[PDB]
mmCIF file of C-alpha atoms in Angstrom:
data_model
loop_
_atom_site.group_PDB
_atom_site.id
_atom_site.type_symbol
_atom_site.label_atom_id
_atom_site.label_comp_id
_atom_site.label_asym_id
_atom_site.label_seq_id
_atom_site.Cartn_x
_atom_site.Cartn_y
_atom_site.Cartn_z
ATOM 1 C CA UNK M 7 116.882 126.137 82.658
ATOM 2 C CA UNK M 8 119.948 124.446 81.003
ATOM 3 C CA UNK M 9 120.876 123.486 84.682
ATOM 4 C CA UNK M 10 117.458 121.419 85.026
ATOM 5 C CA UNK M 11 117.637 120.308 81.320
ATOM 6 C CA UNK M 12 121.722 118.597 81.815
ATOM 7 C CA UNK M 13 120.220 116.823 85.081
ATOM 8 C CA UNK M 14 117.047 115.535 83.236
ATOM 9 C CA UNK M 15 119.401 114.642 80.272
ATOM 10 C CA UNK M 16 121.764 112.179 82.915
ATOM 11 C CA UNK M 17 119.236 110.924 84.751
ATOM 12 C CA UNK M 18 116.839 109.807 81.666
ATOM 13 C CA UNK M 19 119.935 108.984 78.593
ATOM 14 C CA UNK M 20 123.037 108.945 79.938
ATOM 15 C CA UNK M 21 122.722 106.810 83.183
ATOM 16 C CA UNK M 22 123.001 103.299 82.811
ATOM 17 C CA UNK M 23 120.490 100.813 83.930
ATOM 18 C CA UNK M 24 122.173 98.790 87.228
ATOM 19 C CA UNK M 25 120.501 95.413 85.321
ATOM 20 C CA UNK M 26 121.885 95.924 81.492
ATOM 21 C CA UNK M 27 125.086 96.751 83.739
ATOM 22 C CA UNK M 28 125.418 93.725 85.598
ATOM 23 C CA UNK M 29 124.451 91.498 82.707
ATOM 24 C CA UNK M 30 127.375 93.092 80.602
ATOM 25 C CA UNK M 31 130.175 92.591 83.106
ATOM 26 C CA UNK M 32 129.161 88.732 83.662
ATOM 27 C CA UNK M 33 129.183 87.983 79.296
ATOM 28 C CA UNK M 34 132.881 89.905 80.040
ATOM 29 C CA UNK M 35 133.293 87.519 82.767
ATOM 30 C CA UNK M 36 132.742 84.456 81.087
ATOM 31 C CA UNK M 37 134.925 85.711 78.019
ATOM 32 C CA UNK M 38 137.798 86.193 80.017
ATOM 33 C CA UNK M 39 137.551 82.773 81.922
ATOM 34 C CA UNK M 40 136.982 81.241 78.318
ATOM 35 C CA UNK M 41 139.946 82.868 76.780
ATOM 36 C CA UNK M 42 142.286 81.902 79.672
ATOM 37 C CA UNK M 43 140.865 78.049 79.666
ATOM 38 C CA UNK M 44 142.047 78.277 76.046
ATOM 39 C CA UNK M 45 145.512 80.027 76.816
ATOM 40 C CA UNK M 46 146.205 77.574 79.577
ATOM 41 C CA UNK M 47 145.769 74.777 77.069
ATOM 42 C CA UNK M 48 146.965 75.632 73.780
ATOM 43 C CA UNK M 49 149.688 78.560 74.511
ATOM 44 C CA UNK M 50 150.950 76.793 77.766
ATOM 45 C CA UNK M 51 154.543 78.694 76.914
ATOM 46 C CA UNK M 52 152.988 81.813 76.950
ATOM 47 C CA UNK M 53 153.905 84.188 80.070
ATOM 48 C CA UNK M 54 150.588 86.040 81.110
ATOM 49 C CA UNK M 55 149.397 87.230 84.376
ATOM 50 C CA UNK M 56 145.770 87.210 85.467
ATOM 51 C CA UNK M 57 143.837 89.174 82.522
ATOM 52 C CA UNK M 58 141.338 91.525 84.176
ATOM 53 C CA UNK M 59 138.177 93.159 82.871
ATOM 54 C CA UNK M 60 139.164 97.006 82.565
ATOM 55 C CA UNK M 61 137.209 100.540 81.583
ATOM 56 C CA UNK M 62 134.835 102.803 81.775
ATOM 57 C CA UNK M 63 132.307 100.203 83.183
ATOM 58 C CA UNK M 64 133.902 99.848 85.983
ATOM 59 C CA UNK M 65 134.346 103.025 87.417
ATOM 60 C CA UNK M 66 130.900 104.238 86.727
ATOM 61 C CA UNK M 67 132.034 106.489 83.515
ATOM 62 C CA UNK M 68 130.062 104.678 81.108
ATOM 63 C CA UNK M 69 126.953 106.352 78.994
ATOM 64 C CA UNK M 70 123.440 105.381 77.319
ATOM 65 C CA UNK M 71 124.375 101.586 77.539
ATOM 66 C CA UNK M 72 126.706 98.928 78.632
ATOM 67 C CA UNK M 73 128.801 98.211 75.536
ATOM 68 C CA UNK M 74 132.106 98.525 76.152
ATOM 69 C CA UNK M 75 134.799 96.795 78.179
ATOM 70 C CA UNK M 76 138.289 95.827 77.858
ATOM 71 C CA UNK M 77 139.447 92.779 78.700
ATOM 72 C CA UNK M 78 143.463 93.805 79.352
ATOM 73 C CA UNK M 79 145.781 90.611 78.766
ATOM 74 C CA UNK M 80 148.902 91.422 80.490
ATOM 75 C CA UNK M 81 152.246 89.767 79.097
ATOM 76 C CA UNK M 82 155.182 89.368 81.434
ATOM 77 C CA UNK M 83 158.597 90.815 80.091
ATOM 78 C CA UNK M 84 161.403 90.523 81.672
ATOM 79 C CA UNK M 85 162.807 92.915 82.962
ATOM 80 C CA UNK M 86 166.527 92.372 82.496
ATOM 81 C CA UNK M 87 165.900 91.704 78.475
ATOM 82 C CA UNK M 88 163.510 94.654 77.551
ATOM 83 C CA UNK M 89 163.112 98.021 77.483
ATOM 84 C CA UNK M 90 160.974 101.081 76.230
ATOM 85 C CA UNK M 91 161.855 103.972 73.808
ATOM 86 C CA UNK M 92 159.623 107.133 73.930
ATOM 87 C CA UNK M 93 158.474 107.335 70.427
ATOM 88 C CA UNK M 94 159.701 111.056 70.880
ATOM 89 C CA UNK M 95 163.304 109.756 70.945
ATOM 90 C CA UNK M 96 163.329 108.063 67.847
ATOM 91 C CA UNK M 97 163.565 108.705 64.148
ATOM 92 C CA UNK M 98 159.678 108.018 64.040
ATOM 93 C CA UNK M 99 158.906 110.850 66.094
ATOM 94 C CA UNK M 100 155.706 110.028 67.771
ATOM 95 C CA UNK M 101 155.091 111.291 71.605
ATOM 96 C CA UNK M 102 152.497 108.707 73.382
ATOM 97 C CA UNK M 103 153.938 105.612 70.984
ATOM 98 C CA UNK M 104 157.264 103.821 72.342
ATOM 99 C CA UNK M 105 159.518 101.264 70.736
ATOM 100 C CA UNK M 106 160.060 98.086 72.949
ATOM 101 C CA UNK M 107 163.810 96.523 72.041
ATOM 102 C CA UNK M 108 165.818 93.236 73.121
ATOM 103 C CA UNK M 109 168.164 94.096 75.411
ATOM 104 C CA UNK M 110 171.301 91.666 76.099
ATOM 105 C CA UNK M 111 170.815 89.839 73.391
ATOM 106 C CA UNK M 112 174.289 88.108 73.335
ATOM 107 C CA UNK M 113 174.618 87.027 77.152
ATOM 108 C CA UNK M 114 170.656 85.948 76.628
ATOM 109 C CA UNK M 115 170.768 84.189 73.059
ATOM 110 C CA UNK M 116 167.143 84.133 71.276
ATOM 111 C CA UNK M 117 165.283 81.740 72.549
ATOM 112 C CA UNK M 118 165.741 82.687 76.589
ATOM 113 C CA UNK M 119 162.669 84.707 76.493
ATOM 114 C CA UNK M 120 159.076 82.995 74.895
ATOM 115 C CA UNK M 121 158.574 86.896 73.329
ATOM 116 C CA UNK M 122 161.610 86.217 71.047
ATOM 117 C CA UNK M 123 159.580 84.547 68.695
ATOM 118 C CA UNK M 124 157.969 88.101 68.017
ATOM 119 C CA UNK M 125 161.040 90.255 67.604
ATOM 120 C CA UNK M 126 161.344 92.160 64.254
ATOM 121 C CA UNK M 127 164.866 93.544 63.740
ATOM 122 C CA UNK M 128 165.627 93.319 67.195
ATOM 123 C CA UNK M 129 162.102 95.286 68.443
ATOM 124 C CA UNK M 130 159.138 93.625 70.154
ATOM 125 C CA UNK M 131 156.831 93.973 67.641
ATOM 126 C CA UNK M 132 153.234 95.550 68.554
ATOM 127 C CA UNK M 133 152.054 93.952 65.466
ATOM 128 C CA UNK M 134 153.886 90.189 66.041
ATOM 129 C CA UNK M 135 152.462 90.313 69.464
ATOM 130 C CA UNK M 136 148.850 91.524 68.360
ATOM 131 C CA UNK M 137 149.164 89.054 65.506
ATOM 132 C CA UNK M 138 148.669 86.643 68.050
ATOM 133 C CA UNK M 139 145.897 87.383 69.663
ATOM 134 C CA UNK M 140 143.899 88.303 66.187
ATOM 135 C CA UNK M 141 144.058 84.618 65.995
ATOM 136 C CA UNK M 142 142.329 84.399 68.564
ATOM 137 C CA UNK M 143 139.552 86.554 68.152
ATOM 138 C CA UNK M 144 139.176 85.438 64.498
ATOM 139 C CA UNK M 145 138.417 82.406 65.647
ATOM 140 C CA UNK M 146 141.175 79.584 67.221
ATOM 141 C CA UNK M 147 138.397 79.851 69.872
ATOM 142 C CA UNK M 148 135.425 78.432 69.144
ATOM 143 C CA UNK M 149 133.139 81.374 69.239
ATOM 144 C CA UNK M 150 129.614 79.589 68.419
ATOM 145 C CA UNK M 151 130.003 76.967 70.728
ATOM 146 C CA UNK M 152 130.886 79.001 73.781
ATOM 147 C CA UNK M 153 127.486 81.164 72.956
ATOM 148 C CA UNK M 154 125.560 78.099 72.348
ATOM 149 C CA UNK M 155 126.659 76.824 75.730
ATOM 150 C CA UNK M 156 126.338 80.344 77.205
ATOM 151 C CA UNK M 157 123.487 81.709 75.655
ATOM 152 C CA UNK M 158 124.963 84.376 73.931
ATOM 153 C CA UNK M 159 125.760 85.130 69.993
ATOM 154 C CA UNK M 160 129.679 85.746 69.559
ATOM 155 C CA UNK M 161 131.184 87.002 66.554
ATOM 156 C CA UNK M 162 134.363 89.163 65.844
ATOM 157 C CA UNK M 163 133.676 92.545 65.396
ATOM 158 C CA UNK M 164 133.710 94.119 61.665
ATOM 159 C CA UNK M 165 137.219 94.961 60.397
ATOM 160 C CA UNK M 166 139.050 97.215 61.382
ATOM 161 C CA UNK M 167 138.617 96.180 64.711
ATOM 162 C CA UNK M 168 140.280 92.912 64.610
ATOM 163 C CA UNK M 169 141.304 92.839 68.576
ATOM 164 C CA UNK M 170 137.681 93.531 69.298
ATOM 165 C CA UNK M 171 134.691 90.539 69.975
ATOM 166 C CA UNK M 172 130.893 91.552 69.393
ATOM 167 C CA UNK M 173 128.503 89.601 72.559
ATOM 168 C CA UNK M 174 124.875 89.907 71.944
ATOM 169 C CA UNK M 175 124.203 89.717 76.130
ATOM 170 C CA UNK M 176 120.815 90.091 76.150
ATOM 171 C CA UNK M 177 117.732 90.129 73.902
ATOM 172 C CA UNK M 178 118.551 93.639 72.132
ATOM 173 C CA UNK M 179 122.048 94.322 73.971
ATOM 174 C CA UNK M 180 125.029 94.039 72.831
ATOM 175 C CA UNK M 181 128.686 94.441 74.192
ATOM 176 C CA UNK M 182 132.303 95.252 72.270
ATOM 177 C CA UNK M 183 135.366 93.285 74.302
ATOM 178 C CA UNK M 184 138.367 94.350 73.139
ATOM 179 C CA UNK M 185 141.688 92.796 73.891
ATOM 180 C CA UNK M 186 144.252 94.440 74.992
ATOM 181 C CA UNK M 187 147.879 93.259 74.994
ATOM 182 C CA UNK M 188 149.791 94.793 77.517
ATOM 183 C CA UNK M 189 153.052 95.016 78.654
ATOM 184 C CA UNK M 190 154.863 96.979 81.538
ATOM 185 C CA UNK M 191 158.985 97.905 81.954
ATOM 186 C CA UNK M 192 159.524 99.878 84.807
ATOM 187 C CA UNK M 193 156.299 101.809 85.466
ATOM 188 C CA UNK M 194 155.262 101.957 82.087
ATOM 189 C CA UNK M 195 152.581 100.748 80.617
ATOM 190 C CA UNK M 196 152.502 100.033 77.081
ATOM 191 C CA UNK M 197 149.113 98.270 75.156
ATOM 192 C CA UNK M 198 149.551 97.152 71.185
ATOM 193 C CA UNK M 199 146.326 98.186 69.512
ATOM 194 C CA UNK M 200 146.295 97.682 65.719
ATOM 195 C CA UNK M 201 145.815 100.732 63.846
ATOM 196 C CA UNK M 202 144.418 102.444 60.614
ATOM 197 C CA UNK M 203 147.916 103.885 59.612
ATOM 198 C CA UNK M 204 151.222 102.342 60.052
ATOM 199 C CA UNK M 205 153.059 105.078 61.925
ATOM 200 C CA UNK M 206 151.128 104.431 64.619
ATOM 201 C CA UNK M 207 150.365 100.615 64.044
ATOM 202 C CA UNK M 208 154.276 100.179 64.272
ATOM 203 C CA UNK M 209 154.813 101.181 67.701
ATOM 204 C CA UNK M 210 153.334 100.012 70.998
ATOM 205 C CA UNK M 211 151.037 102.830 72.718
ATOM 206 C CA UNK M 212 151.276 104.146 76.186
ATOM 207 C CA UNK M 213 147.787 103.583 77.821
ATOM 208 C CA UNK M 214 146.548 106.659 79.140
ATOM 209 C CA UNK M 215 143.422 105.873 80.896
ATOM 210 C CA UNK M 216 144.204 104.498 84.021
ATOM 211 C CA UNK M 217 146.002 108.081 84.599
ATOM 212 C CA UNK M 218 143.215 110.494 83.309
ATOM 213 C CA UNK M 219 140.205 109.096 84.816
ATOM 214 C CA UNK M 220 142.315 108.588 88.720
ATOM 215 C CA UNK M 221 143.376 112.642 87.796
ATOM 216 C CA UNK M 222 139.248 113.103 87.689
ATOM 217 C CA UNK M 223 138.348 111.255 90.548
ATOM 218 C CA UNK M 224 140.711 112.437 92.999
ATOM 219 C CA UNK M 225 139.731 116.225 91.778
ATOM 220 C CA UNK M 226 136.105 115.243 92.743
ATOM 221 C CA UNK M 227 136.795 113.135 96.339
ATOM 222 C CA UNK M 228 138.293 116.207 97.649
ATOM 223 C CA UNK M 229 134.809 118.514 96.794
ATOM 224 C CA UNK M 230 132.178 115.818 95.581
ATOM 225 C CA UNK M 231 132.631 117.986 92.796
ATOM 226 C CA UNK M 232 130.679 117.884 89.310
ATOM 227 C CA UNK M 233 133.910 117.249 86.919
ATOM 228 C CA UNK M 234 132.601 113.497 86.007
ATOM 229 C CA UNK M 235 129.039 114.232 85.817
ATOM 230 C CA UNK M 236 129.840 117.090 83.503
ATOM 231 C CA UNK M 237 132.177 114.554 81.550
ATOM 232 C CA UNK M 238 129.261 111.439 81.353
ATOM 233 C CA UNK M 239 127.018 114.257 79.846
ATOM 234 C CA UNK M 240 129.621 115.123 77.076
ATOM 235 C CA UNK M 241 130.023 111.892 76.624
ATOM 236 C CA UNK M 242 126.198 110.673 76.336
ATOM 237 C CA UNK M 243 125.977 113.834 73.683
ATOM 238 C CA UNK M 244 128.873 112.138 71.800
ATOM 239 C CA UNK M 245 127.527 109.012 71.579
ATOM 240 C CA UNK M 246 124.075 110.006 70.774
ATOM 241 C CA UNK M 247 125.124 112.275 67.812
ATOM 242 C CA UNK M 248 126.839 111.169 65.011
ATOM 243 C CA UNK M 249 129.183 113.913 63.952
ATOM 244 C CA UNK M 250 129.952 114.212 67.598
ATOM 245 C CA UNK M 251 130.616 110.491 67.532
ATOM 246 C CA UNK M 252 134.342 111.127 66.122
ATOM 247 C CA UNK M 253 135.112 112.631 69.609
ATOM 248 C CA UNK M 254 136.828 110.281 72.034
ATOM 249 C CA UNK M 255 135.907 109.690 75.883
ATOM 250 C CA UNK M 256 140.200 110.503 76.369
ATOM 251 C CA UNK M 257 139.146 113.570 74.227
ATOM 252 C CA UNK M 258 136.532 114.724 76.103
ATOM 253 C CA UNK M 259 138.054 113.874 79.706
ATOM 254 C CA UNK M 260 141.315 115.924 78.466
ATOM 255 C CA UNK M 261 139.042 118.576 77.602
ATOM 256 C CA UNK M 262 137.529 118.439 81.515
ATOM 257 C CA UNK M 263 141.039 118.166 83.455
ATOM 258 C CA UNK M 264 142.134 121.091 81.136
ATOM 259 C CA UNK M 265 139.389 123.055 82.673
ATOM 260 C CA UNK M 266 139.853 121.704 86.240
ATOM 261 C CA UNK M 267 142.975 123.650 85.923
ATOM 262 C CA UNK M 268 141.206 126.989 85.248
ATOM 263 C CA UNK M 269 138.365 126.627 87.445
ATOM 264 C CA UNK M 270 138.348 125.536 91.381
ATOM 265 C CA UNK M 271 134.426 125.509 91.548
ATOM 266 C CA UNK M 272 132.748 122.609 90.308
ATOM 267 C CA UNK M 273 130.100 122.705 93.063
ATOM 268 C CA UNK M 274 126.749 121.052 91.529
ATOM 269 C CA UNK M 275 125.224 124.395 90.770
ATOM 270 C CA UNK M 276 128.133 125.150 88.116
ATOM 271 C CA UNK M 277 127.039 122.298 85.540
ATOM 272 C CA UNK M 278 125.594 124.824 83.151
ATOM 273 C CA UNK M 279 128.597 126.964 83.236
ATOM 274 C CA UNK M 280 131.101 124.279 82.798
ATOM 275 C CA UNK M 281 129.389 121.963 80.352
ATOM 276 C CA UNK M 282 129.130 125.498 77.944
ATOM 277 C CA UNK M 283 132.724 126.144 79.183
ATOM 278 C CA UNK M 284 133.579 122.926 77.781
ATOM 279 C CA UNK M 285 131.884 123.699 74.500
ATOM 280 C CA UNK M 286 133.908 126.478 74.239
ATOM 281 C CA UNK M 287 137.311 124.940 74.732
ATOM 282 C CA UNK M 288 136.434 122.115 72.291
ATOM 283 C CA UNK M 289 135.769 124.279 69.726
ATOM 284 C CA UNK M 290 139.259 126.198 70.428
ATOM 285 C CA UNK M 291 141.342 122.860 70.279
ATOM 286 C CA UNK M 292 139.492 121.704 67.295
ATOM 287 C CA UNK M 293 140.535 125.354 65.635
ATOM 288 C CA UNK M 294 144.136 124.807 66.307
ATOM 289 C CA UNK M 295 144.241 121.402 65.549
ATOM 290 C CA UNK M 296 145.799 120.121 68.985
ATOM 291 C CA UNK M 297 144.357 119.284 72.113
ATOM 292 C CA UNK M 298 147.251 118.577 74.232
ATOM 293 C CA UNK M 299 147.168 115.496 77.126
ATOM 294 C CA UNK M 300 146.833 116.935 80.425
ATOM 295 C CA UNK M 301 148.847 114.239 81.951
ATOM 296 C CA UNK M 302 151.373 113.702 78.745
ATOM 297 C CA UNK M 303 151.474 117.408 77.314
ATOM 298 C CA UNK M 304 153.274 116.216 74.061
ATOM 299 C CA UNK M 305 150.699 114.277 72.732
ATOM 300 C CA UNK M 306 148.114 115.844 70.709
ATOM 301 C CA UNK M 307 145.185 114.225 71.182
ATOM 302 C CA UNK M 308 143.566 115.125 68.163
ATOM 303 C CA UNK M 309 146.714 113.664 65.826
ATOM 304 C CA UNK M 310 144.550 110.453 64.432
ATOM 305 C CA UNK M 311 141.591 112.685 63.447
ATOM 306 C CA UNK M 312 141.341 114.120 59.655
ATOM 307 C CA UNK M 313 141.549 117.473 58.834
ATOM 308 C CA UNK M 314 137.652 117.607 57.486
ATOM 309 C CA UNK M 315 136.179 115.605 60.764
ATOM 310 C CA UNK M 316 138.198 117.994 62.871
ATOM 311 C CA UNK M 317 136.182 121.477 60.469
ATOM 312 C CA UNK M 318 133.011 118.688 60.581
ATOM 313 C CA UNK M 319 133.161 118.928 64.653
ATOM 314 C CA UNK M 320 133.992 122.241 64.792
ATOM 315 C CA UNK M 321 131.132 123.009 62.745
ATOM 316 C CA UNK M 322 128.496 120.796 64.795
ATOM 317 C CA UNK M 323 130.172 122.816 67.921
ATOM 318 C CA UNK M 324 129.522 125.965 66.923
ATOM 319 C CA UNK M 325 125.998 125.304 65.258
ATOM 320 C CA UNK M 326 124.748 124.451 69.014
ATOM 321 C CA UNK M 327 126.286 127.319 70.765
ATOM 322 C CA UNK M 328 123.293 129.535 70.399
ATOM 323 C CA UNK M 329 121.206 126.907 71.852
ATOM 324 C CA UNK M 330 123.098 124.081 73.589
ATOM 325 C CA UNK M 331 120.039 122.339 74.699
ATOM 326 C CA UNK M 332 119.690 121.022 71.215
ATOM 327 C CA UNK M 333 122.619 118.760 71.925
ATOM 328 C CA UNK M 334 120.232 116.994 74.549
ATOM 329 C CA UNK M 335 117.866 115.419 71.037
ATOM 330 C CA UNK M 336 118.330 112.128 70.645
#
């Protein structure tokens, strides 16, 4: 049955080894003790709290193998000189994206706040601010003598990805870390990631994750329902097939809280049905173009993806509906 062929498929590919696991989160570990050493002695100035290792890793939503985690750096503002636009509210138009602007900046000449130094026109520059970490990553830190003293090979990850650090762990495992500059005004969080395309690359972007994946787990602690094990499935299928690479985990979990709100049974016997279900509704965002946020409806999900990946996936989609088990092939 498809039933018996989705559990066979999580237990065997997308499950995680506990050991490659705990191996991962200690190189992430030792990163994030290395980087603040080197904050604390060359950017003294700079007001940070504790960085923290974030993501999917650590609440058990990562798939195939442990190669992701973010490593969240999180700035301190405050609060009395700062504060967030909604992208949506500006001439740039752009739900999910906010500007960050200098607030009293007469009473509180430049110069009373370190993030001054990364103001463009009177805006906190996402770009100024990642600027500074790129630095980083590109090397003020001296990559190949932290792995030669850790016994692990470091290198910064291939462009674009210039926030992002590649850590061969283990013999045959390796990790991305990407760094995450973070700020928060109020209760918003905002994250400056660079980006392929300057509308977005110009504005600092709301992090959504926290908020999706704490939607999903409090759906399944009230049932011990089957909403993330249906998700880590979609998500092992993405990851394991390259035109269904192009989908993102926020994708796919929008994709599952969408249907959480048509559905009330997610006992363990409904996999089959939802994981087709889900099939089904991927291939009817990808048709209109716009797979709205469950959490944010304004932002379209699907806005960074081109036209032909978007036909591409919708393609792929509808190639497997007659016999979704092919999806399981690795």
């Amino acid at each position: 049955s498809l039933q018996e062929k989705l559990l066979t498929y999580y237990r065997n590919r997308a499950a995680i080894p506990a050991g490659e696991q705990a191996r991962a989160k200690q190189a992430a570990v030792d990163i994030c003790a290395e980087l603040r050493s080197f904050l604390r002695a060359k950017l003294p100035d700079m007001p940070l709290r504790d960085m923290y290792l974030s993501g999917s890793l650590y609440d058990d939503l990562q798939v195939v193998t442990a190669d992701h985690i973010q490593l969240i750096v999180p700035l301190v503002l405050e609060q009395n000189l700062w504060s967030c636009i909604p992208g949506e509210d500006t001439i740039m138009n752009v739900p999910g994206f906010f500007l960050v602007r200098r607030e009293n900046p007469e009473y509180f000449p430049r110069g009373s706040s370190y993030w001054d130094r990364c103001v463009v026109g009177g805006y906190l520059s996402p770009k100024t601010v990642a600027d500074t970490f790129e630095k980083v990553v590109a090397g003020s830190i001296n990559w190949p003598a932290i792995g030669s003293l850790l016994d692990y090979v470091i290198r910064p990850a291939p462009p674009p990805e210039a926030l992002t650090l590649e850590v061969q762990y283990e013999r045959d495992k390796h990790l991305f870390i990407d760094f995450l500059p973070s700020v928060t005004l109020g209760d918003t969080v905002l994250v400056a990631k660079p980006h392929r395309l300057a509308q977005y690359d110009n504005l600092w972007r709301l992090s959504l994750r926290p908020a999706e994946t704490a939607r999903l787990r409090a759906l399944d602690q009230a049932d011990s329902g089957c909403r993330s094990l249906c998700l880590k499935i979609l998500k092992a299928i993405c990851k394991s097939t390259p035109a269904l690479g192009h989908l993102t985990a926020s994708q796919l979990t929008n994709v599952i809280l969408h249907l959480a709100q048509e559905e009330a049974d997610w006992s363990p016997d409904m996999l089959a049905d939802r994981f087709l279900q889900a099939l089904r509704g991927l291939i009817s965002y990808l048709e209109a173009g716009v797979l709205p946020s469950a959490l944010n409806p304004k932002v379209n999900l699907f806005a960074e993806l081109t036209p032909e990946e978007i036909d591409e996936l919708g393609y792929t989609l509808y190639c497997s509906l007659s016999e979704p088990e092919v999806l399981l092939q690795t």
